[PDB]
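2.7 Reproducibility. Because tokenized structures are sensitive to small changes in the input, we list the exact sequence used for Cofilin/actin-depolymerizing factor homolog 1, including any N-terminal residues retained from the expression construct. No trimming or masking was applied before prediction.
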Amino acid sequence: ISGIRVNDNCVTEFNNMKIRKTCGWIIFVIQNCEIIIHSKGASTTLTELVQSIDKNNEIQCAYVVFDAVSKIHFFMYARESSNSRDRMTYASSKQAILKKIEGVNVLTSVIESAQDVADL
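Resulting structure tokens (single pass, no recycling of outputs):
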């Protein structure tokens, strides 16, 4: 028992996005011991999405899905200035969220800023 659960809404809205077949994204965070949706939207570019996240210092870590229609990509975000305990929490809960969105292209490395995606 992790003490962290996935809110069913994460899966509802991920499926919404998947079935819509348009370029979109969802950001998930952990709040009060559950993984919930922080925000969701239509995409411009993956780099602009991560730039927006970089600008919000309240997002220290997150899970991000980016639906590019051809494929849906998943990564863990954690800013350089994020604390090690927070990062461990997210890393450790990563598999829990992935169980409900199996089929995504996972990036194994933690993304720390928009720079990291700006090439790939």
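The chain has one domain: 1-120.
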